[PDB]
Every structure is written in structure tokens, then in C-alpha cells.
Ligand binder design. Structure first.
Ligand SMILES: NCCCC[C@@](N)(CC[C@](N)(CCCCN)C(=O)O)C(=O)O
Ligand SMILES: NCCCC[C@@](N)(CC[C@](N)(CCCCN)C(=O)O)C(=O)O
Ligand SMILES: [Mg+2]
Ligand SMILES: [Mg+2]
Ligand SMILES: [Mg+2]
Ligand SMILES: [Mg+2]
Ligand SMILES: [Mg+2]
Ligand SMILES: [Mg+2]
Ligand SMILES: [Mg+2]
Ligand SMILES: [Mg+2]
Ligand SMILES: [Mg+2]
Lengths: 296, 296, 297, 296
């Protein structure tokens, strides 16, 4: 199978005066490249995918694919939707503009059955030719891709090669790899990056790497080479920042953190997202003080 | 405030060969009218709002609004979205086609804070002029509109007049009405329709009424005139079907029931929604048999 | 056509003094309940800190109750549950020997029996004594739940089992219960939702709030049973703020704090692992208490 | 600090004619000893502690203490209770009768606060001068010992040396060991034994080792010597049996498995525990057939 693994970053989408700051976007990707990141995920959850127009969705993917040309960094484009026809179109668009693969979240809100999830992802997988990574985050979608469903899709479709797990349930990660040791399980879940890798996971799609890409990258490569004491030591150091980045819903804390670090000039969200509370603002800024945040 | 209360129906959307069967849609709405329903909700969750194109949204509201003219039956159009800019446009779009009010679900997937939720709904409420009904269904959205947020929204904008509560938490309904007895709390969970009405709720938005409109209508009107023992007896009779209509995710069971009763000519969903389980199919057909289902 | 114990009931607190049961304060708190329209008292239940009581203190509190209530219309529904079936049978026979009118028996906690085991647990209790038995379902504390089907089978198969106290926070289960078995006595176990459970056919409450405001809980219950539903809802709404604040921390920590603030008990003592609340919740409890009128002795 | 770590077994209590089969009890401990087990936990949750009299509690601890005399196996006696006065007595009893340490479950049913939990365990720790291992199992107790409480107890009491975690929340174990890396975290969930050990855990208290002691024993020792490829393979092989052992509440499945393997002579529980359903009986028996179960 064609795969996309390693240390990956769920890119934030910087806004300025209500529009996407395109040049800030390219420089944030270049910082990630220069800090050992293996792949970037434009216009996903952390990139505020729900509040983007369809042209800003297209434009941000194009910037990522053009900034990653001439490097080892792959572009894993966000292309999920709770309507199968739309997710097929988003998949076809990501492939036609040079993405290396697609991330595709489980359909949200409309709560399809396990049968529906199978026909959903199979319809995406058989219409386009690029690697497809499933994304399970039941706290946001209202549904779960069962272990049985993930494994059937992995065996039935050649483009489906793994799953990003944001369940908070390492029992499910044991279940998956014990029955299907050939799939690429990706951590979607920063605080427990090391335990997922130590059980055979092959990468992370992390929010923290927006702020500390060099540490997330080192954590990942230590683990993939089975340097488990070094990878765990980094996972332990990152715990405080890994947790505070969800004091409110992601990407509210991480974007506040990038702004406090001076990596974005403006702290803008699109409604219904907004800036955090004054107390949570102080909590993020105080956790930040004990870490070293690398510049451009 | 202008209000939309009483017995209301969350309309299913009949498909025929993958497109919307318009004639049948008009014929199902008049069936609801002739059976004592006070208002209809086109293209909401039960109407498969996520898998409809933007024209299907339009024509379904237009047919509903037109079939209802010359009756007292109001059209409360679904117009929610998890992007505030989009939800404002859909609200403007619903008034522009003759809706009496709008239902607007809490943003899903992107998990906004209470501050963001307030500014989301305040933006919708102040951009257009028809009654606005909040909809809280945390099992589907990943977020919950707090009682204080609901009450603040109700008191600050003239448009917002109540909430459809589908949390399954009667404590929350006591909380709302004990602190703000002027809002219209609308039931969003059929099994507990009577207990919500007996605590001061002023209507239901029902899935069961697609199948049994006369019984949901009678339940609601008995309760509003405080004939509690009749409202309770009908609520008790409906319990078995109220549960079975959610053996799988709505609107899968209810549409299967409409098809078995010969009220729609084809049992078509749009992916990721699909036909029900085989065992659940039998469960629907067997409890369906214990009630009387009126024809056209 | 079974024997029932219904109406407005109070889950009594157990006042401590220097680690000992203040027997006389216990007798005088029961008299306050009697004089304020309460239909029954539940000694040595959850609110009475049954887990930290000695076995002798268990009895004396039932004996104090049975005897203070003699010469009144107030019944004694004794706490007698256990997560060991052999023990709960003895506790049932025991409450019968000391004059109890019926027993409350919590679902087995910690050891999570299956529905089959729950059925055999309660069938053993019910067939051991000829006294009314009220099931108590509180999954947040026990880790298990008595399903609707199990409760109905126990109600139909045992003559002593006559209902359930529900502290599920799930009005759907109460609809389910009474729609399929309208003859059972469903008792509310959550004060904030006392009125909605009565309005669906519930026949009583076992209340924490009536320790503090017995006249209002009793009036709430009696209005509802007489189908004066708007008056019952009006009191339920007034009680909401105090009904919620009484669980800012684990019951009986808030209510015992309130009783001390109202001068109804003379010391604010718990038995470990229970202790007094945080200072922030203490202030919130004491500030909500100030908007209600609290009866003395 | 004095510690008790490694591969440990939560002993079942075999009954014969409603009575404790003492000679069977001694021999089940000898089997564990002969199969590489580092410690035994008599009269815990798996030992049906709730339904044992206070004399059967003693006798089983004395049998454990006497069967392990002259071996490297330590006795971690069960001594928890939801009344602080009783748990102090149970602790005092285990020490006077030669236990190496005590397991002490968080108070159940009465839902103490974190303040109360600290005062409960500090009273126990100051009661006896033997190691005390906390036990956090919120699904059974109704409360959880927070990370902050565990750490305060670990630093304030010299006898408290770690925690057995059965929350199913690998995030909490990262939290514990990242802030207090000197504590002994013991796994209380068999399916995720390897991930807890690979993150710095120092042992397991297992239900599965009753049936397959050599395999759990090997898993723990592979992990403690950091042969993670070997530990993970055994953990993955154990996944099916680890799950079926909880198809119904523990210890119903495990005692059923011990009886099917001819290791106990009668399938007796004390009510409210009872024999499993006929279908789970068949499922337990099916799974069993794919492993090898060592005899006496
Ligand atoms: N960025 C490309 C579109 C992806 C779809 C969507 N923006 C929302 C899905 C959507 N169907 C979008 C509305 C557009 C047509 N109504 C929805 O909100 O339901 C998302 O949640 O990721
Ligand atoms: N109110 C006096 C009754 C005390 C009985 C018991 N300690 C039962 C607790 C226990 N026996 C465990 C304590 C003995 C150590 N295993 C049980 O779990 O059943 C309780 O429920 O509090
Ligand atoms: Mg490339
Ligand atoms: Mg549903
Ligand atoms: Mg629904
Ligand atoms: Mg409580
Ligand atoms: Mg309680
Ligand atoms: Mg020894
Ligand atoms: Mg224990
Ligand atoms: Mg000490
Ligand atoms: Mg269990």
C-alpha cells in the first residue's frame, strides 16, 4: 500500500481582516518543513475547515502543495464530509491539485450506521487513486467507526491504509493492531502520542506541532526507531502544553498560543469560534513560559 | 414575540430514483394538515438536511410553504449550520421563501464555547425577522447550549422565543422553565413528550408524527388544555413505537416505517445513510402493527 | 393488591456529636418532620451515612424512628440494602423485628451483578419477610442498573415488592416503567425532578430537601397526588435552586451543611471518608439558603 | 520506599457447597507460583470480597501468606472499604498476619470528595507500616482519585507507593508518571497491560493470569526488561481472551473459564453473583479453545 506516515501537523488557518493570510500560511508551512515534520494537513479540523469558503479550501491546499514541492514533506489534504457525494468531490479535488493523500473524517451529525460508514468510505476510495486515511473522533462527529469496519475497509479497498484515532481509548488501538498489524494507526491525540506509537502506531497528526514542531518530530522518530526512553521523555515534557491546548475546543487554544508566541500577527477566528476566556488566556500564556518556542 | 408552538412534524424527504419526489412531498404535508398538526419542519435532521443539495432545500421549503397556504399550519424551516455566516444566509433564505419561522441547530463538529454559541445565535437572530427556535441535540453536535446561554439569548433578542430540547434530561427542562417561564420549550424526544408538556412545554417537534400524526396531535392538544390523564395515556401507548423509531439513527427507522405502510413509493436514502439492519427492519414492522396508521 | 408506603418521605440525616450518634437530636429532627406533614421517614439510608454506621447504630436509629413515629400517621421505611445477598436478607428480617413498616433496599453496589443476579437478590429478600420492599436504583453510586424488565418481573413475581425509588435522572425509564406496569409505585429519587415524576404517575418522593424544607416537599407531593398540578409545579420550580445546590458536592455533605447553618443540628460532623465541603460551595449553599423560609422546631 | 511490583494475580475464591474450598485455594496459589507470578492479591474484587464473611477474609489471607512462604512471591492483601475506620482495621489485620502490602480500593457508593479521599488514605497509611497500593476503578466505586490527590498522598505518606489504575484512560497514566516518575503505576485492565507497562508502569494486577499465568508473567517481564516487541506480541495474542473475560461482570467469566479448564471443581458464586447466560457460556468456551491453559 501507498502510505503517508511519520510526524504530521494539523495546520492552523491564520485570518487577517476576515480573510486568509496567504503569506503567513506559506511561512507557517515553511517553518514546519524546516523543523523535521513529515507531512502537513491543510484545512482540517484545526484549520477551521467548517468555516472556510470553498475557494479558501481550494486555495489553502494549493499553497501547501506548492510550498512542499522540493522537500520530503507530504501534503495530506483534508477532504471529509457528512455527505458522501461531497466527500467524493473533495477527494477528487485534493487529488487533482497534487495532494499526496486525503484525510477524511467520519460523517458528523447525521450518525450513519456501520454499514453506511462502509459504503461511505468505499465510495470515496474507489473514485480516486490517492491514499486515504480514515479519521475517527466520536466526540465531534457523534458516531464511531468500529474496529471491524476500519479493518474491512483496509482489506477491501487498496487506497485505505490506516486511521487517525482521536477516541481517547487506547484499548481500541490494541484491538485494531492485534487483528490487523499491517494498517498505519496515526495518533490524533497529543497527550498520548507515545503510548499509541509504542503499541505500533506509525505517526501522529498533532496540534502541538503548530507550536513545537521540532519536539513532536523528535518524539515520533525516537519511537519509530524504538528509542522508547527518549520518546517517552519528550512525551512527558510536552504533557502540560499538550493538555492546556484543549482547555477550550481546538483550535481556540492553539491559535491563541501561536499568537502569544508572535507567530501570527492577528488572533482572528470565524464564528461560531471566538477568542478564549481571560482566565484561559492567562492559563495558556503561563504554561507557555516554561517551554522553548522556536521562531522562523 | 411571534411564536410557533403546538404539534409539529419533522418531515421526512421522500426520494425517487435519487431525486426528491415532489408530488409525494406535497401529499405527505397535506396528510399532516388533515390530522391536526399545527406546523411542519421541512429539511431538518429528519429530512436529511446534510445530504440535500441547495435546491432541494429550496423546493422543499417552497412546496411546504405553498401546501400550507390557506390553512393555519405554519412552516418552521430548518436553517442551521455550524458556520455562522452560512446560518445567517440560510435564515435570510428561509424568510425569502415564505417560512413563518426557522429552526436552527447548535453548531456541530466544531464544538464552539458558550460565548461563541451566544454570538452565533445573536448573529442569526438580528440579521432576519422571523421567530427563531434553538435546537439542542448534544448527542449529534458535540456541544450543549447551556441553560444560561438559552435564557440570555431568549431575553436579549426578540426573535428567539424558545428551544427544541433533545438532550434526554428533564432536569434541564425544569431548570429552563423555573428561571424563564416565558420561553416556549419544545419537546425533541418523542418517548418523553408528555412529561415535557406537563412541566410547561408548549409543543413537540416529532418524528413519530410522520407515521401517527393524529395521536401526536391529540397528545399535544390534550396536554395544552391540561387534560393530563389523556395526554399521558396517549404518551404511554406511543412508548413502544417512540423507542423503535430510534433502534437505528433517525431518519432510518421512520422512513422504513413510512415505506412499509405504503405512504412513500421507495425506500431511498442518500449515503452515508442506508437501509436499516435486517433485525431492526423486522422490529419496525412488528411494533408498527400495534397502532392504527391513517392513509391519504 | 399489595401493601404500599407512598407519599412524601424524608431521607433522614444522622447527626453526629464527637463521633457518636446524637440520639436525641435524631429524635427531635424526626418530630420536626412529623409536625410538618411528612408521610414517612427513611432512617439509615444513603443520606444517613449508612456506609460509615456501625451495626448497633443502625438499629438504634431505626428504633428511635419507629418509636418517635408511633402515635402519628408517619411510617418508617427502614434502610436495609446490601451488595451481599445473604446480608440484605438479614437486614430485611431485622428491620421487621424492630417495627419497621417497610424496607428500602438499594441495588447491589460495586460488585455489578447481572440482571439475573439482581432478580435472585431481590427475590431472596422479598421471600424472607412479609414486609413491603421498595427497590432503589441509583446507578451513579452502585455501578449497575436494575433494568425495566427486571423491576417489572420482581413486581409481578413477589408480593412484597411494590415499587422502585428512581435516582436515574432519566424520565424515559419512568415512562417505560409505568406504561408497561401502571400498578407499581414509582418513587422519585431526585428532588429537582420531583414534580415531573409525579405528573407521570409517580406516587411519592424520598427527598433530601425535606430535611431542610419538609413543609414544601410535603405540600409539593400532596398537591400532585390530588392532581393540583399547577401548584405542585410552582413549588417544584421554587425549590430548584436549593434542589441543585444540595448536590454541589456529594450528598449528604451539602444538606448536613445546610442543617448546621439553619441551627437544626449542633455540630457539622461527618464520618470519614466524608468531610465538610470546600469553602466555595459552603458560601454558595449558604447564599442559596437565604432565599427560602426554613421552619424551626 | 518499600514496593511490591511485577506480574500479580487477582485471585478467585473457589467455593464448594457454599463454602470456601481452602485446599483448592492453596493450590491455585501454588499454580500461580510455579508459573512465574511475582505476587498474589487475595480477597479482592475478583475474589468476591463483597460476599465473604470476615472470617473467610482472614482465612484466605492466611492461606496466601503460608503458601508463599519460602518463595519470591509477595502477598498484596485486599483491605479496602468505603468506611475509613474499617479500612484502618482491615489494614491492621493484613499486617499482623504477614501480608507484604495491602491493596485498598477507593471508597465506593458514598462518593467522597478529593479532600475526603486524601484524609481516608492518610489515615490508613498512618495505621500500619506496610506498603499501600491505591486502587482506582471509577466504574465500580462511583468516584475517581484524581492525579493531584494520588501525588499528594504519594509525597505525604511514606507507605503509599503507587496506584492500580482501572479507569481505561491512558491519559491519566501519562499525567501520573510525567509529574511523579518515582511512583509505581500498576495496570488494572488486562487488554492494555502492555501500553501501561511501556509508558513506565511497573506491574499488572491481572484477571487473566488466573487462567494463563505464564503468559501474563512473560508479558510483564518482557516489558520490564524493555523487550517491547515481545511484550506487545503476547499482549496482542491475549486480546480476545482479555475481552471475553468481561463479557459479563468480573469475576463471573473468569470463574467460568477456570471451571471449563478443570481448575476448580464447581461453578459456584455467592449472590448477587451467579452463573453467566448460556450464550456467554458458549462464547467463553469458544475463545478458551485457542490458547493453552497450564494445569496444576
Ligand atoms: N470545505 C469543503 C466542504 C466540506 C464540508 C464542510 N464544510 C461542511 C459540510 C456541509 N455540507 C457544507 C455546506 C455547503 C452546502 N450546504 C454542511 O455544512 O453540511 C465540513 O464540515 O468539513
Ligand atoms: N453498615 C454496616 C455494614 C458494613 C458492611 C459493609 N462494610 C460491607 C462492605 C464489604 N463487606 C467489604 C468490607 C470487608 C472487606 N472486604 C462488602 O463489600 O460487602 C458496608 O456496606 O459498609
Ligand atoms: Mg511532494
Ligand atoms: Mg437517533
Ligand atoms: Mg433526531
Ligand atoms: Mg450526590
Ligand atoms: Mg443521592
Ligand atoms: Mg515472602
Ligand atoms: Mg480492595
Ligand atoms: Mg505514612
Ligand atoms: Mg467488569
Amino acid at each position: 500500500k501507498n502510505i503517508i506516515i511519520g510526524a504530521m501537523t494539523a495546520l492552523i488557518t491564520p485570518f487577517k481582516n476576515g480573510k486568509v493570510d496567504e503569506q503567513s500560511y506559506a511561512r507557517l508551512i515553511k517553518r514546519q518543513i524546516e523543523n523535521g515534520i513529515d507531512a502537513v494537513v491543510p484545512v482540517g479540523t484545526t484549520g477551521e475547515s467548517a468555516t472556510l469558503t470553498h475557494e479558501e479550501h481550494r486555495t489553502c491546499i494549493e499553497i501547501a502543495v506548492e510550498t512542499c514541492k522540493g522537500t520530503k514533506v507530504k501534503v495530506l489534504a483534508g477532504a471529509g464530509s457528512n455527505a458522501t457525494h461531497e466527500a467524493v468531490g473533495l477527494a477528487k479535488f485534493a487529488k487533482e491539485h497534487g495532494a499526496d493523500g486525503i484525510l477524511s473524517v467520519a460523517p458528523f451529525y447525521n450518525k450513519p450506521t456501520q454499514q453506511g460508514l462502509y459504503e461511505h468510505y468505499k465510495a470515496i476510495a474507489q473514485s480516486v487513486d490517492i491514499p486515504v486515511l480514515l479519521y475517527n473522533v466520536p466526540g465531534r462527529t457523534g458516531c464511531e467507526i468500529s474496529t471491524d469496519t476500519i479493518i474491512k475497509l483496509f482489506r477491501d479497498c487498496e487506497n485505505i491504509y490506516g486511521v487517525k484515532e482521536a477516541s481517547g481509548n487506547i484499548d481500541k488501538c490494541v484491538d485494531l493492531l492485534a487483528h490487523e498489524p499491517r494498517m498505519m494507526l496515526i495518533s490524533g491525540e497529543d497527550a498520548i502520542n507515545y503510548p499509541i506509537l509504542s503499541n505500533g502506531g506509525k505517526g501522529v497528526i498533532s496540534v502541538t506541532s503548530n507550536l513545537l514542531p521540532d519536539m513532536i518530530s523528535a518524539l515520533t522518530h525516537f519511537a519509530l526507531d524504538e528509542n522508547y526512553k527518549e520518546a517517552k521523555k519528550i512525551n512527558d515534557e510536552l504533557y502540560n502544553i499538550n493538555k492546556i491546548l484543549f482547555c477550550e475546543s481546538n483550535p481556540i487554544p492553539i491559535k491563541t498560543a501561536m499568537y502569544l508566541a508572535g507567530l501570527i500577527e492577528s488572533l482572528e477566528f470565524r464564528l461560531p469560534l471566538c477568542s478564549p476566556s481571560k482566565e484561559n488566556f492567562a492559563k495558556i500564556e503561563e504554561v507557555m513560559k516554561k517551554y522553548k518556542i522556536k521562531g522562523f
